[PDB]
Design a binder for this molecule. Structure first.
Ligand SMILES: O=C(Nc1ccn(CC(F)(F)F)n1)c1nc(C2CC2)ccc1Nc1cncnc1
Ligand SMILES: [Mg+2]
Ligand SMILES: [Zn+2]
Length: 313
């Protein structure tokens, strides 16, 4: 119980900030995750030997893809850590445990293809689950790793509590289906504006946790411009691979996935920021006012993409 994790001074300061980048040293990401769980939860919540074994099985089942990789996993967990630390009274001891594991696991075994490519390709996973295809896969990968010998980080919980935390995790991982985000944000907006939003209603919590997951998942659009710019090259590399695989099936891809249309990218990001990211972080700031630095950093990047369009960079 007396084995604290420390970080170098710059990381220890900078990790509390929403805009933190976890850096290029893979070998430090686990200790970064353990440090975040230990401060977010308490040093006790997880048996350190089990956590570490769980972290490394999770790392093993992320693939070597440009964007939806191990680094994205720990990045999305860091964003959740920032949110939880700036809203510390709002969430239960179980939610804090669950949400950081959810974020770490939310993209397990991702191959860099969307749900619609799975459907067009006729992948087996699309037969198993018609909606939220990859996301139900990501959850079942989480359950798999949890059922490996010596990996049950939730062993200490009652049957009841274990069921509650697996259901937080399932809803949280499903909520990273951006198709679901649109209605979910729409309903939260309506509930907030009419003043019916009530964080004691469990179905209202679920929605707010869903919006948090979208926010954490998109958080590469809320970093400092140089990090957002380089991370965008990563997601577009998957997009263009997927477009390539669309052409292989006899299907003209949408322009966003078409690498012959690299020129359209800056205008593509305007679209994305206006239609997804700005509305996401606006609604989140309304519900959780301490999350405002994510909205501010998102607006700055939107304005950086406008400068790109106008030849100013
Ligand atoms: O850019 C993304 N999605 C786009 C682009 C164009 N459209 C069409 C539109 F605009 F209608 F939505 N959608 C994007 N998507 C995602 C996931 C939902 C797929 C995550 C990050 C993303 N971006 C990014 C930028 N910088 C640094 N990291 C990630
Ligand atoms: Mg995903
Ligand atoms: Zn993700």
């Amino acid at each position: 119980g007396l084995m604290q994790f420390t970080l170098p001074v710059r990381l220890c300061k900078e990790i509390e900030l929403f805009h933190f980048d976890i850096g290029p040293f893979e070998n430090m990401w686990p200790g970064i995750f353990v440090y975040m769980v230990h401060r977010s939860c308490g040093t006790s919540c997880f048996e350190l030997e089990k956590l570490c074994r769980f972290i490394m099985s999770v790392k093993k089942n992320y693939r070597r893809v440009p964007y939806h990789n191990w680094k994205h996993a720990v990045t999305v967990a860091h964003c959740m850590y920032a949110i939880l630390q700036n809203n510390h009274t709002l969430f239960t001891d179980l939610e804090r445990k669950g949400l950081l594991i959810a974020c770490l696991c939310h993209d397990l075994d991702h191959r860099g293809f969307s749900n619609s490519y799975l459907q067009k390709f006729d992948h087996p996973l699309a037969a198993l689950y018609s909606t939220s295809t990859m996301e139900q896969h990501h959850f079942s990968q989480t359950v798999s790793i949890l059922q490996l010998e010596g990996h049950n980080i939730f062993s200490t919980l009652s049957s009841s509590e274990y069921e509650q935390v697996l259901e937080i995790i399932r809803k949280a991982i499903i909520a990273t289906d951006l198709a679901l985000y649109f209605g979910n944000r729409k309903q939260l907006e309506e509930m907030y504006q009419t003043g019916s939003l009530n964080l004691n209603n469990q179905s209202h919590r679920d929605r707010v946790i869903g919006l948090m997951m979208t926010a954490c998942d998109l958080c590469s659009v809320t970093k400092l411009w140089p990090v957002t710019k380089l991370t965008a090259n990563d997601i577009y590399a998957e997009f263009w691979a997927e477009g390539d695989e669309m052409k292989k099936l006899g299907i003209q891809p949408i322009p966003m996935m078409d690498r012959d249309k690299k020129d359209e990218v800056p205008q593509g990001q305007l679209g994305f920021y206006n239609a997804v990211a700005i509305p996401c972080y606006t609604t989140l700031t309304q519900i959780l006012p301490p999350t405002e630095p994510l909205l501010k950093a998102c607006r700055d990047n939107l304005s950086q993409w406008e400068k790109v369009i106008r030849g100013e960079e």
